Amino acid sequence: AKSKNHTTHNQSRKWHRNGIKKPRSQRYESLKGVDPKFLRNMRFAKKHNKKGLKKMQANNAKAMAARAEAIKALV
């Protein structure tokens, strides 16, 4: 009593009932499996972003004032 041994006959059909969906792409994928030495350093960089805040805020206010002067000169 020998069987059928293997096949792939009805399988494509079976797969395509429910699509063959592409793998759901997000923005902001994880940093799992990224070269450790990198990840330390981007972690440290992220740690000290709040250091150098007061400088950054002022720079944007100076930029915003320069934009407001430019738009007044245009109008």
Partner: protein, 159 residues
């Protein structure tokens, strides 16, 4: 039932082409992949360290990691019913920049040129592409000489 061995059936795939054996010429090594570079994988026989598996040869995907002398590269591999985006660590020698994306960037650059200009002019320009339309109305001058008649030729047995 076939053997599950890693390199089964790559007699031809991983085999340097005709009269291109020997030293892996150096541009190959010394060109830079960043994150998110579109990259097509193509295994190579000379370099056996960091070889991709025979399933990812031909396949294109994006770079996610870059180590000292290899590049982590997300590629989509189908499995019966489900496409699995998965991340593989190929050594540079088995990898090129895929040009597929550059022709796109060329077009967007050309669009940004054609958007900046034609704004002060006022005349809006076709930025979208369009498929090859039917080939328009036109005259054909049979200049002096008439058409050439083509009789089909009588059969004969050559061999």
């Amino acid at each position: 039932t076939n053997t599950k061995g890693k390199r089964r059936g790559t007699r031809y795939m991983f085999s340097r082409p005709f009269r291109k054996h020997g030293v892996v010429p150096l541009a190959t090594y010394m060109r830079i992949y960043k994150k998110g570079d579109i990259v097509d994988i193509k295994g190579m026989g000379t370099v056996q360290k960091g070889m991709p598996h025979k399933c990812y040869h031909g396949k294109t995907g994006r770079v996610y990691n870059v180590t000292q002398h290899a590049v982590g590269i997300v590629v989509n591999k189908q499995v019966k019913g489900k496409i699995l985006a998965k991340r593989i660590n190929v050594r540079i020698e088995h990898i090129k920049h895929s040009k597929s994306r550059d022709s796109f960037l060329k077009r967007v650059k050309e669009n940004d040129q054609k958007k900046k200009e034609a704004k002060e002019k006022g005349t809006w320009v076709q930025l979208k592409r369009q498929p090859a339309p039917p080939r328009e109305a036109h005259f054909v001058r049979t200049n002096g000489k008439e058409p050439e008649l083509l009789e089909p030729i009588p059969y004969e047995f050559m061999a």
